[PDB]
């Protein structure tokens, strides 16, 4: 019926009653579980039902359900949809909806912070140039000279028979990946495609490993336009290691601000195709995935050699030893630069506290175990031993197709 959920380290049991509130299908069926898949394989009454549920969530949140303001707002939404096929959110509803979307995101380990989100209303944007200005202000606010603050900027919603507002880049700050025809990639191989799009739209490329990409910004039914971010706006952290003096010589660095810009924000049936949001990094994202993934910067063997490890055999655990030191260098370097960062132990501990808050608040918390457990030191963190239930609640952040 409702899932019984166990923590194997503590022996404690909870029951998730919240999942009964999900109205959207995931990929699993009783025949087979597709929980480890990264992406999904793929009128008026529906919109109105999603709108009413959301308006109901909103008036409940301010302890005013059943108030006359509640009923009048439901009548406004209904009148707008019945007449125009769509409707519009008040700013206060948008703020609430953006926070709920973060709270509802099953793959985010940072949700203890969900109530602390600066929401920028950019819905009065009519051009790519205007989008750029809003983006620069977001970056400035969020960066805050290294004292990072979570934020989201919301551009105009999707509308019928009109193109979307889109940011083509997957994050506001990304490093170029240049495909040298002799196979290799200089820079970040995750970004080869976006890099080439930038060049063919007129960007003069560099040839470095850490060249910050310009933004491709698209207003409805227009070709995207190219915008170089003012270098003063892009905070970056040089990587050094507390005891290995040679580490600094690797020339490694990463940017301070993780700002995802290609997700769709869905609130009350309305869809915001451009709504970039930013937090701060957990160290393993940079140290383990971005730097050590074989299909990313792939620096493991380089670091292992500098540590004089036996690279000839798996059983020497050279990969494990190198990864630890790289992760240590990330933490040390961000701490030395006074740039906000969280290690995976601290993060997972705060997530356990979040699960407990949410059990009391809502009777559950949607969580994707495969994403919540960090990519190194899995069972050394408390989340590994915690059973989790994954389901989709709205408001939500969703994936959407690339605009090209």
Ligand X SMILES: C[C@H](O)[C@H](O)[C@H]1CNc2nc(N)[nH]c(=O)c2N1
**Residues forming the site for ligand X (CB under 6 A):** 8, 36, 38, 370-371, 384-387
User: Residue 120 CB: number of other CB atoms within 10 A?
Assistant: 20
Using CB under 8 A as the binding rule, whether residue 286 contacts a second copy is answered as: no
Interacting residue with ligand 7M3 among 76, 285, 293, 301 (CB under 6 A): 285
Among residues 19, 108, 292, 365, the one annotated as catalytic is 108
301 is in an annotated binding site: no
Q: Is 318 a catalytic residue?
A: no
Interacting residue with ligand HEM among 152, 167, 286, 323 (CB under 6 A): 152
Q: H-helix or E-strand containing 353?
A: helix 344-362
Using CB under 6 A as the binding rule, whether residue 391 contacts ligand HEM is answered as: no
Q: Is 196 a catalytic residue?
A: no
Residue (246 or 399) nearer to ligand 7M3, CB: 399
Residue (218 or 390) nearer to ligand X, CB: 390
> Shortest Cβ distance from residue 285 to ligand X (Å)?
7
Who's near 216: CB < 8 A, 6+ residues apart?
A: 167, 168, 169, 194, 197, 198, 201, 224, 225, 226
By a kind-dependent CB cut-off of 5 to 8 A, residue 2 interacts, out of ligand HEM, Zn ion, ligand X, none, with none
Tokens, residue 337:
């630069």
> Shortest Cβ distance from residue 376 to ligand HEM (Å)?
12
Q: How distant, in Å, are the alpha carbons of 50, 230, 265, 266 from that of 99?
A: 17, 29, 11, 12
Using CB under 8 A as the binding rule, whether residue 398 contacts a second copy is answered as: no
Q: What is the DSSP letter of 287?
A: I
231 to 290, contacts with ligand HEM by CB under 6 A? 277, 279-280, 282, 285
Who's near 90: CB < 8 A, 6+ residues apart?
A: none
> Shortest Cβ distance from residue 283 to a second copy (Å)?
8
CA quadruple 38, 401, 277, 164: dihedral, nearest 10: -160
Using CB under 8 A as the binding rule, whether residue 13 contacts a second copy is answered as: no
User: Residue 11 CB: number of other CB atoms within 10 A?
Assistant: 7
Using CB under 6 A as the binding rule, whether residue 108 contacts ligand HEM is answered as: yes
Interacting residue with ligand 7M3 among 1, 31, 32, 38 (CB under 6 A): 38
Residue (125 or 299) nearer to ligand X, CB: 299
178 DSSP β-pair partners: 186
Total residues contacting a second copy (rule CB under 8 A)? 71
Using CB under 6 A as the binding rule, whether residue 150 contacts ligand HEM is answered as: yes
399 is in an annotated binding site: yes
45 to 104, contacts with ligand HEM by CB under 6 A? 102
Q: Is 280 a catalytic residue?
A: yes
Q: Which range binds ligand 7M3 by CB under 6 A, 53-61, 281-289, 326-334, 384-392? A: 281-289
CB burial class (10 A; 0-12, 13-18, 19+) of residue 22? middle
Question: Between vectors from CA 144 to CA 142 and to CA 147, what angle results, nearest 5°?
Answer: 95
15 is in an annotated binding site: no
DSSP string, 154-201: EPPPP-TTSPPPEE-SSBSS-B-EEE-SSS-EEE-GGGHHHHHHHHHT
218 to 247, contacts with Zn ion by CB under 5 A? none
- Residue owning tokens 């175990």: 369
Q: Are 224 and 218 in contact (CB under 8 A)?
A: yes
Q: Is 398 a catalytic residue?
A: no
User: Residue 210 CB: number of other CB atoms within 10 A?
Assistant: 16
Q: In angstroms, rounded to a whole number, what is the distance separating the alpha carbons of residues 367 and 364?
A: 9
Question: From the annotation, which residues make up the binding site?
Answer: 28, 33, 36, 108, 171, 280-281, 285, 290, 370-371, 384, 399
Q: Which residues are known to be catalytic?
A: 108, 111, 280, 285
What are the residues binding ligand 7M3 (CB under 6 A)? 38, 110, 170-171, 258, 260, 279, 281-282, 285
What are the residues binding ligand HEM (CB under 6 A)? 102, 105, 107-110, 113, 117, 150, 152, 277, 279-280, 282, 285, 342, 347, 371, 397
């Amino acid at each position: 019926k409702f899932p019984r959920v166990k923590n194997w380290e503590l022996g404690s049991i909870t029951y998730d009653t919240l999942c009964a509130q999900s109205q959207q299908d995931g990929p699993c069926t009783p025949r087979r579980c597709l929980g480890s898949l990264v992406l999904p394989r793929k009128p008026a009454e529906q919109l109105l039902s999603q709108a009413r549920d959301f308006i109901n969530q909103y008036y409940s949140s301010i302890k005013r359900s059943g108030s006359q303001a509640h009923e009048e707002r439901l009548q406004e939404v209904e009148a707008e949809v019945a007449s125009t096929g769509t409707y519009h959110l008040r700013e206060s509803e948008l703020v609430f909806g953006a926070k709920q979307a973060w709270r509802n995101a099953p793959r985010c380990v940072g949700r203890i912070q969900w109530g602390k989100l600066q929401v920028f209303d950019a819905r009065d944007c009519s051009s790519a140039q205007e989008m750029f200005t809003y983006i620069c202000n977001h970056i400035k606010y969020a960066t805050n000279r290294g004292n990072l603050r979570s934020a989201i900027t919301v551009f105009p919603q999707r509308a019928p028979g009109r193109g979307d507002f889109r940011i083509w880049n997957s994050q506001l700050v990304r490093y170029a990946g240049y495909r040298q025809q002799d196979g290799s990639v200089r820079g970040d191989p995750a970004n080869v495609e976006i890099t080439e799009l930038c060049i063919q739209h007129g960007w003069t490329p560099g040839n470095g490993r850490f060249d910050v990409l310009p933004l491709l910004l698209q207003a409805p039914d227009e070709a995207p336009e190219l915008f170089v971010l003012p270098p003063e706006l892009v905070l970056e952290v040089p990587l050094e290691h507390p005891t290995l003096e040679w580490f600094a010589a690797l020339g490694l660095r990463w940017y301070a601000l993780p700002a995802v810009s290609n997700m769709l924000l869905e609130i009350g049936g309305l869809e915001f195709s451009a709504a970039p949001f930013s937090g701060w990094y957990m160290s393993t994202e940079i140290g383990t995935r971005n730097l050590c993934d074989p299909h990313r910067y792939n620096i493991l063997e380089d670091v292992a050699v500098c540590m004089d490890l036996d690279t000839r055999t798996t059983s020497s655990l050279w990969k494990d030893k190198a990864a630890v030191e790289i992760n240590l260098a990330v933490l040390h370097s961000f701490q030395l630069a006074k740039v906000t960062i969280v290690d995976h132990h601290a993060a997972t501990v705060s997530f356990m506290k979040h699960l407990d808050n949410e059990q009391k608040a809502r009777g559950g918390c949607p969580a994707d175990w495969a994403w919540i457990v960090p990519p190194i030191s899995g069972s050394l963190t408390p989340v590994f031993h915690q059973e989790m239930v994954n389901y989709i609640l709205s408001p939500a952040f969703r994936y959407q197709p690339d605009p090209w």
